[PDB]
Amino acid sequence: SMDHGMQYSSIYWETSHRTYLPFWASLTQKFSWKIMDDQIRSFLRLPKPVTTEPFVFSSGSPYIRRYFGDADISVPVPLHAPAHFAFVPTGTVSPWEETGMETGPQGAAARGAAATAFRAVLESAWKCDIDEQIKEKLHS
Amino acid sequence: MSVFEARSSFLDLEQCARAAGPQRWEAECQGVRQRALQAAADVMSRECGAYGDSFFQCYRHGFRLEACQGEKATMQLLRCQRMVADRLVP
Amino acid sequence: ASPMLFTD
Amino acid sequence: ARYCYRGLDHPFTLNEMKDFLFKLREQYLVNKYEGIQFPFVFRQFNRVSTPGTLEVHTSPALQQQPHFH
Amino acid sequence: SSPHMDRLLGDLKLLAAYDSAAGWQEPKAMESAFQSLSWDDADVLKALPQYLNCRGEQKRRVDFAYAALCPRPVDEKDPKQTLMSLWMKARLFSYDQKHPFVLSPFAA
Amino acid sequence: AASTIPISQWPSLLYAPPSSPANPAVEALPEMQFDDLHYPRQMLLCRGAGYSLEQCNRMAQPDARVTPENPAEKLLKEEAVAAIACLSQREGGKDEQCRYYIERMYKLANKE
Amino acid sequence: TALPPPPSANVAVSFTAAPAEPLSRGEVKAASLKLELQNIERELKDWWMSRKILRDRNIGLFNLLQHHNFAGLSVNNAKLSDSQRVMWTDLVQGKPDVEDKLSVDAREMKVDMYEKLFKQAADLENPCRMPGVAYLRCLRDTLTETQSARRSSCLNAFSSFDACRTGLLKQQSAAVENSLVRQNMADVRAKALFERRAVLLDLVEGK
Amino acid sequence: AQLHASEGFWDSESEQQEARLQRHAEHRNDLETTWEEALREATLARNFDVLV
Amino acid sequence: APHQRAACEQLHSEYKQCLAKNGRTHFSACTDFHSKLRACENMLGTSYCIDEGINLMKCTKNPDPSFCAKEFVAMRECNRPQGPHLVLSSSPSSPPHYELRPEVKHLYNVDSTDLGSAVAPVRSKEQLDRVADSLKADLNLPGYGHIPYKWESLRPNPGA
Amino acid sequence: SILGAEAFPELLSKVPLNPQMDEDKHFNKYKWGNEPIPVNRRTGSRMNSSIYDNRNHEAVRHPWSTDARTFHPNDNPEADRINTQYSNMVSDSFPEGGFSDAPRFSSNWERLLAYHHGLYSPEKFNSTTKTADEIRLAVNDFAAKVHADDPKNACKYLMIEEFKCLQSAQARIDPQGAATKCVKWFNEWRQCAWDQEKMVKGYNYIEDRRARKHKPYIGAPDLQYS
Numbered sequence A: 001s002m003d004h005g006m007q008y009s010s011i012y013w014e015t016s017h018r019t020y021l022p023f024w025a026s027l028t029q030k031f032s033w034k035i036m037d038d039q040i041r042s043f044l045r046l047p048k049p050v051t052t053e054p055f056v057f058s059s060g061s062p063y064i065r066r067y068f069g070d071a072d073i074s075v076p077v078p079l080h081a082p083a084h085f086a087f088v089p090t091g092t093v094s095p096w097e098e099t100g101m102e103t104g105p106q107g108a109a110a111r112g113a114a115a116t117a118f119r120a121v122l123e124s125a126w127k128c129d130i131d132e133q134i135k136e137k138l139h140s
Numbered sequence B: 001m002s003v004f005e006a007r008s009s010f011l012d013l014e015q016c017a018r019a020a021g022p023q024r025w026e027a028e029c030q031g032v033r034q035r036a037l038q039a040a041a042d043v044m045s046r047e048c049g050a051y052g053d054s055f056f057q058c059y060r061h062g063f064r065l066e067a068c069q070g071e072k073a074t075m076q077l078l079r080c081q082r083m084v085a086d087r088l089v090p
Numbered sequence C: 001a002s003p004m005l006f007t008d
Numbered sequence D: 001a002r003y004c005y006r007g008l009d010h011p012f013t014l015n016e017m018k019d020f021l022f023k024l025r026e027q028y029l030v031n032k033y034e035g036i037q038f039p040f041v042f043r044q045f046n047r048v049s050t051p052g053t054l055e056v057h058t059s060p061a062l063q064q065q066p067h068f069h
Numbered sequence E: 001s002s003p004h005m006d007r008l009l010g011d012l013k014l015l016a017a018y019d020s021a022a023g024w025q026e027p028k029a030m031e032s033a034f035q036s037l038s039w040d041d042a043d044v045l046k047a048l049p050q051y052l053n054c055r056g057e058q059k060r061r062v063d064f065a066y067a068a069l070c071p072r073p074v075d076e077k078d079p080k081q082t083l084m085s086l087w088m089k090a091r092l093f094s095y096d097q098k099h100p101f102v103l104s105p106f107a108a
Numbered sequence F: 001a002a003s004t005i006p007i008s009q010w011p012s013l014l015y016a017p018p019s020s021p022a023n024p025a026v027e028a029l030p031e032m033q034f035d036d037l038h039y040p041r042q043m044l045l046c047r048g049a050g051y052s053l054e055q056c057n058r059m060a061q062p063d064a065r066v067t068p069e070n071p072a073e074k075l076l077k078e079e080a081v082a083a084i085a086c087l088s089q090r091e092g093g094k095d096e097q098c099r100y101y102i103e104r105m106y107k108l109a110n111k112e
Numbered sequence G: 001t002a003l004p005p006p007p008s009a010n011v012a013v014s015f016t017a018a019p020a021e022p023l024s025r026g027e028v029k030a031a032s033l034k035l036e037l038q039n040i041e042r043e044l045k046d047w048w049m050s051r052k053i054l055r056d057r058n059i060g061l062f063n064l065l066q067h068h069n070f071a072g073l074s075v076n077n078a079k080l081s082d083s084q085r086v087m088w089t090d091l092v093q094g095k096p097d098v099e100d101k102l103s104v105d106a107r108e109m110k111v112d113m114y115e116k117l118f119k120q121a122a123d124l125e126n127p128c129r130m131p132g133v134a135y136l137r138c139l140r141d142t143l144t145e146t147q148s149a150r151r152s153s154c155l156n157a158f159s160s161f162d163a164c165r166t167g168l169l170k171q172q173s174a175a176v177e178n179s180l181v182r183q184n185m186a187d188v189r190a191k192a193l194f195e196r197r198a199v200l201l202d203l204v205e206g207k
Numbered sequence H: 001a002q003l004h005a006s007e008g009f010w011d012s013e014s015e016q017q018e019a020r021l022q023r024h025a026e027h028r029n030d031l032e033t034t035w036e037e038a039l040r041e042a043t044l045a046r047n048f049d050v051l052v
Numbered sequence I: 001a002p003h004q005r006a007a008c009e010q011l012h013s014e015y016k017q018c019l020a021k022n023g024r025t026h027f028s029a030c031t032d033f034h035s036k037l038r039a040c041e042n043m044l045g046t047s048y049c050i051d052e053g054i055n056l057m058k059c060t061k062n063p064d065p066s067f068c069a070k071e072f073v074a075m076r077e078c079n080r081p082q083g084p085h086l087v088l089s090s091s092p093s094s095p096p097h098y099e100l101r102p103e104v105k106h107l108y109n110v111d112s113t114d115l116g117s118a119v120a121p122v123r124s125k126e127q128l129d130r131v132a133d134s135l136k137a138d139l140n141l142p143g144y145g146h147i148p149y150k151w152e153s154l155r156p157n158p159g160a
Numbered sequence J: 001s002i003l004g005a006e007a008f009p010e011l012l013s014k015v016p017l018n019p020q021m022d023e024d025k026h027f028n029k030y031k032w033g034n035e036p037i038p039v040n041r042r043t044g045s046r047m048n049s050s051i052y053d054n055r056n057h058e059a060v061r062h063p064w065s066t067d068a069r070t071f072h073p074n075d076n077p078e079a080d081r082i083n084t085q086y087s088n089m090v091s092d093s094f095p096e097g098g099f100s101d102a103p104r105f106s107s108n109w110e111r112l113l114a115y116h117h118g119l120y121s122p123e124k125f126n127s128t129t130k131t132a133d134e135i136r137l138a139v140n141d142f143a144a145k146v147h148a149d150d151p152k153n154a155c156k157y158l159m160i161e162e163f164k165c166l167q168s169a170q171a172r173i174d175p176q177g178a179a180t181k182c183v184k185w186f187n188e189w190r191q192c193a194w195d196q197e198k199m200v201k202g203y204n205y206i207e208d209r210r211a212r213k214h215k216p217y218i219g220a221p222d223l224q225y226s
Helices: A034-044 A105-110 A113-139 B003-020 B030-060 B072-088 D014-032 E003-023 E027-035 E042-053 E057-069 E079-098 F007-015 F038-049 F053-059 F077-089 F099-110 G025-067 G082-092 G104-121 G129-141 G147-203 H002-006 H013-045 I002-022 I028-032 I034-044 I050-061 I069-078 I125-139 J019-025 J086-090 J108-117 J132-149 J156-168 J175-200
Strands: A063-070 A073-078 I086-088 I097-100 I114-117
Touching: A063 I114, A063 I125, A113 B003, A113 B030, A113 B072, A113 E003, A113 E057, A113 E079, B003 B030, B003 B072, B030 B072, B030 E003, B072 E003, B072 H013, D014 J175, E003 E027, E003 E079, E003 J086, E042 E079, E042 F077, E057 E079, E079 F077, E079 F099, F007 J086, F007 J132, F007 J156, F038 F053, F038 G147, F077 F099, G025 G147, G025 J108, G082 G104, G104 G129, G129 G147, G129 J132, I002 I028, I002 I034, I028 I034, I034 I050, I050 I069, I069 I086, J132 J156, J156 J175
Parallel strands: none
Antiparallel strands: A063 A073, I086 I097, I097 I114
């Protein structure tokens, strides 16, 4: 329901806004000197651009130009099938699994050294308290 | 590290203490004491680590979150520790 | 300090 | 004009890049859907093709979104 | 029955309150926080001069724990901040010299 | 007066925060560090060297690459100890009881 | 493929078919067996679906990496160039070093190739990146030298690099072993559950 | 007409379904949060009466 | 013969040193060495890129409108250790083509060995029409060429 | 034996940890009082944002059932915002406690399948906002690693800046929203890369002669540019 839409906004020309078109504007037409320049260059054997050569020296990896019906319209295409490399071990990561909940080194490291240090401090204080309790229990 | 192991550690501690006596216990029974305390500490961290991480998180966020409102963030941890101790040492 | 902290 | 005659290697900022892609999209839509008009592309024209029996109904009310309080 | 734990948690709460009151520009609240910070602890008072002269592994442990709990560097000019940092470090030093810290995740 | 900081200005807010009664060392805020990879890296390197887990745990040490220590703790040592003595005796300096030592420390640190 | 939905009554039954008598002991037991069966089937479904999904995902990853011509710490790629393979096996297993046969320009080129390859291989999160880059920077420092003089200076960095390398290798081995063990345990558990379901379906009662 | 709106008479079927889903989700979240709390407390207490 | 192999390597290094010393403007001085280097080639099965280097040096001082691209790529492909990967096909056909060896086809992202002509296309209304029609067909966009408003004029195309 | 006697000095001495606690417990130690953070800014769900989206200002749809009540950013903030720290600023655009859209999966294969299809990461769904200290620690560690990687690199601080902006914009939980902020610095890094390559490998071009009207006016200065 997008095609063949209705006129949604109004069209208008504000008072005394200029148009910059004369009465022969419909008979005016554009022109480019590029075709004539190309013909003259070809006829006089003037310096050609490097786009006439399909090989590409502008990089280290091999590129070849693909032309769309004309030497003026080209795209470079790389030839290599590049090999990629990973200095990574396999099977060392399970991102779907939440690791903050599992008990272990991997879990603490998916958590932080800060949480682990806090846990160790609480551990030490708890051990102090329980040592005091042991002392008073066994002195009796 | 398990509750069973920690209980056996504390039984070792108490029986070796009854063997030694009230005068030379702290001298003779240091290694068993450290082992028992380390096992109890492992148990405590395992059973009360969620509450400690929650307190840590509230402290990072300045106790601005919903779960940080009130005193439950502290009372839960203290209750876990008290329960663990009452389960282990006696 | 870093060069992007400068604004003036 | 910015690259080849002033010497700027990076002529387009992010705004100009977005504008370029917007205009590319508008060209694509204008060539894909015949008679597509303002709300989808900045374009208005009068001689449009309509079915012949144009029904006029009220829009539905805006969707009630859930909200606190 | 859990004095070390209780005073630790109280100190942490008071540090958070001091930071919040500083952000919200509340001298009354932040001075209350400073005053309520367990300055009457004989253990920490005794461990203060020990911490001030310790060196090496114990000092590195206590610095690591303090940077865990409070990694922000306090202003060298504000003595209240300096003193609360010193008090917390002395508390951690006392806890460590009673029962040392085990900060690595790998352990058995 | 205190106007809103939009989201685009937050990177500047982190390293140039507004003024407070308790400011941090803004010049040292880029120097605050705490590595979560210290012990994992240590274990990986030692196990690659060929050691066992027990040897690695015995050789492990805590990170020295953390935020530096306040120099006031070494320069104002006696003044700070005296202030802490006053606080411990006078209940945290209620109703201005450690103002003497605190003012001496403040002057020593600030110098107008 | 699926089955069609089951048939439904055309006339509405509200409660006329409800039991007018309480259940009996054998019926209660059969109900308990049915609950056991559905729990077993739930567990079996969890195992089977997890296994299927993980197999499909990892086969897709393997096919993608083969399509894009990737090579890892286990050099298991046949489409590699021999030079690229030598470079990767030096970076993984041996010692990267420039030969005295080469001219200083070619040594620079070799070190640049090493650095490009290693920086594409290892990202900033990788632990071995810093040791590798340090070792190659030392090689750049010591290009205009012999291997005998270069060893003394670059050994301290090559040691750390080799250490991180062997650590990664050990991690991979341990991961493979643990995954194999877990897989086998899960499959044994599933088989035992299947036989338990079989005997309970032999014991089930009703129509 | 305002009474009809309280009963959702002017709503569309999409809006009715969305309100229904919203109630469903709120109720589900309440229940699962309560379950987590109950299981934690009953685990630290080691008592089934607490869960009950 | 390892003695002869090493002697020839020494000779080749000497030739390279002499050529570098003289420069690529004065390269006709080192025609001394071709006598022995061609014998090295025929004996050891080796190539030393002699003809290609000489042709490149000669061309670059009196260059082609191609700017010696084929000479450059020929030298680059000769100087490879295992041999040239890319070569220029020899033809009775007017346009030459770039070709890829089969034994290195698995290193390149190509369906065939023919990488297209070695010269760009010639300008032609018909080729442009063909390419444009092909692109229109591949795109398949209903809406191309539609003019919803045209400036009202007796001329069919106002302006252009 | 009472639990936690010495552990609530905030209660014993009427010290509020925050203005919300001050208002609740009626300590009245905040001279400027408290403007409560409303619930729509304390919690909510992820929403769509762009006006060129049809479901704009609507909650994000997931495979699982999730509350569809959205986080509403502060669009009309008060003039005086006494606390301009990150703690109070982040609540205007994200909730400190994270979104209320997290799942509790009945099975492991649902989690697996959601991840496989790109609809779940615990990094994103079970997480809070990052504190300024955490962000700064991360940024300084990343900067150290990059400086070790190469000191003599011109794109160094630009990479560090995009990292800083991503961390501040909380890309772990709103990656698309943060990338929308940080891709500008990514583009600048992309430019610096080429600017460095062309200086390392000397690349230049033949500049044309000066134009006849390079200066618009004879009395104007023609400031020389490299």
